[model samples]
Target: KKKNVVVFGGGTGLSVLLRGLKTFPVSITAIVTVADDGGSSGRLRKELDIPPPGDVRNVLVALSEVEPLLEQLFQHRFENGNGLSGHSLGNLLLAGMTSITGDFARGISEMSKVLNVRGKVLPASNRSIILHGEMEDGTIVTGESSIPKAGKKIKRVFLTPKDTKPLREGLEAIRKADVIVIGPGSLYTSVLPNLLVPGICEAIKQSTARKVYICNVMTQNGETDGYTASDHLQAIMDHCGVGIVDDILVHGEPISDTVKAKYAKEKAEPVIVDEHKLKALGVGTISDYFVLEQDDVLRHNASKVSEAILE
Candidate 1:
């Protein structure tokens, strides 16, 4: 049997990771966060009374086995129109499926069948969840979208109705996984949501799989401002409340001067991870010259990052 790999995150983060991993032989499962209360998903959730459709829709298309052109159509956004403008085709498809099946999981299954998706995309949970963030300065931010904008050093992200359970199969997947990959996303947003789920942290703590965190290549201005590599690792440990991760992948060298200058324009600095601290965490750190310099832009190239993880 192929090794089972479970990745957890939301939106672009999950999609980028899966795009690279799909070519590998591992059996992949992507658990997407549904804490989005913005955009078409927010509108649909309020008007239609279902969990947010945006992130789940993105994950489906990322892992989709359909042709690239068809996948592009799924992601196509209406540039001009009425209320439907800015809405994605995949969102509409998932929403329509939810209406027909009357069960979100079934909708996912049916959608999965249509796309012949390379991996399973499971919602973190089946219900609508409100994510709340508390900043280091003690100001509270309610709603998932506002946390990043609050501009305070984030203290932590905790969910309302805190004792929430994950999808049953999500727990089962973790239990059987060969390795569990946590991030290339915002520390508080994409990565932490799943850990705060009622039993997920415990499942990860007990899992036999090697837990790993793929570090971000650049710091988000508001979210991770002035955060060093070790700062990032410690922050993750604090949130999860478990030493589950045994390995980490960090970009080795500073990016090209031109690329660094470009990222600096946006207040994004090349992330620097501390080798000694990583070693102290009992984390096997692999620092290769893996930084992706694309036309003088610095970002984590999914293929290079995935290759580092595989190595």
Candidate 2:
């Protein structure tokens, strides 16, 4: 039997990781955050009263074993149209599917079959969840897109309706998983929103799986400015508590001056892998050259990260 792998997080990082993980002989279930309230996802969420579909859409495309043309069609964003401008075809399809099925998870299931997605994609919650970031100054910033732009150090993030229920399938995935992979995405917005979904973190804590966290390669400006690798893990512990992570995977390679210079313009820098501090947190560090620099952007080399996860 194939090993059951349950992955958590949202944004491009989760999608990038899934692309490689799908090539492996394992069962994967992606638990994505629905706390988005920006751009097309936000507009659709407000108009249709459903969970944001952007993250889920990206995950669908990543796991999809379809032709390049079909993938392009799904990701095609309308540059012109009155109401459709700025919306990706995938997001619209997801919303339409949700309306037809009358349930968000089932809608995703329907789309999965259409895209021939290799693994399961489940939202953190079924409803539209508002993510609130409490700044270090005690000011609260509402919405996922707004959190990182607040320009204040985020103290913690919490979901509204306070008791948002996670999908039973997602929780069950964690329980039966052989390995539970977390992160490689935005710490507060993309990652924490899913963990903060009531029982999700608790389920992870109770699971017997080998929990691994793939720390981001760079320190995100507002979310993790000047943060070390240990700081990232510490933030997770601060929000979700300890014993949920057994190992943290950090990038070990040196980035080029040219690449570093580009990110510096964005006020981003490579995250220091502080092994001693990470050791003190009781989580073993799996550090290696995992950075994939392309077009001056840093991303986890999906193949390498997945290989390490399975190892």
Candidate 3:
């Protein structure tokens, strides 16, 4: 039997990771967060009273076994059109499905079959959640869209509707998984919000699976400024009240000067891998040259990261 893998996060990082993991012979169940309240997703959530489907849509497309043109259509967003502009076709389809099915989780399940996705896609919760950030200055910033723009160092983030229940299958996947992959996404908004859910963190902690975290390649400006690899681990423990991850994949290669200069322009910096501190926390560190420099932009090499975990 193939290994059962449960991957978690939201946005581009989750999608990118899924694209690589699907290549391996594993049963993947991607648990995506639904705290997103931005762009077309935000508009649809407010209008439909359903969880935002943007991240889930992206995950489905990434794991989909569809042809190029159909995948293109799923991702195609209308430009400058009245009522349709800026909305992705996949997001719209998910919205319509949720409306018809009357449940967000059910809608994703049905869509998965339609797309012939390589693995399952599960939302963190069925209800729409609002993410609030508490800054070090004691100011609260609401909305996932506005949290980064708050220009304050985030101390902690929590989800609204504290009773929002996770999909039963999502919890089950964590328990049965052989390896659980956490993130390479937004530390606060994309990754942490899902952990903030009532039972998700506790479920992960109790699971016997080998839990791994794919740490981000760069320190995000407002969220993780000057944050080292150890800092990331510390934040996770602080938020969840337990160190659930057993191993972390950290970038071990040196960045080119040109790329470093470009990143400096945006106020981002390569994450420092503080190996000793990481070891002190009782988590093994797997270091590798996992940087993928594309068009002068830095991203984690998904294939290499997945291989390291599976090995």
Number of the predicted model whose TM-score against the real structure is largest: 2
| Global fold similarity of model 2 (TM-score) | 0.98
C-alpha RMSD in Å of predicted model 1 compared with the true structure: 1.9
Candidate 3 vs. true structure, TM-score? 0.97
Stretches of candidate 2 above 4 Å error? none
Number of colliding residue pairs in model 2 = 0
Give me the candidate number with maximum lDDT. Answer: 2
lDDT tens per residue, model 3, 1-311: 69999987778888888898899889999998999999999988988788999999999999999889999999989897788788989999999999998999999999999999998899999888899999999999999989988878999999898778898898899999999888968889888998788888899999999889888888877888999998998888888866589898899888998998899987899889998999988889999898787899986667898899896
Kindly list the per-residue Cα lDDT of model 1 for residues 1-311, writing each as its tens digit.
57788887766766777887888778988887867788888878778887788888878887788788998988888887898887888888888898898877678878988999888888887777788887888888987778877878787788876656688999999999888888766777777776677788889989988787888778877678888777888887887765667788888886777877888888888788888988877788878765565578654667776766655
Instruction: State which candidate, 2 or 3, has the greater TM-score.
Output: 2
C-alpha lDDT score of every prediction, in listed order: 0.79, 0.91, 0.89
TM-score (all chains, Cα) for each model:
0.93, 0.98, 0.97
Clash counts per candidate, in order, are 0, 0, 0
What lDDT tens digits, residue by residue, belong to model 2 across residues 1-311? 68999999789999889998888899999998899999999999999999999999999999998999999999999999888799999999999999999899999999999999998999989988999999999999998898889889998889898878998998899999999998767998888888889988889999999999999888888899999999899999999999789999998879999999999998999899898999999998888899777797877778889999997
lDDT of predicted model 1: 0.79
List the candidates ranked by TM-score, beginning with the highest.
Answer: 2, 3, 1
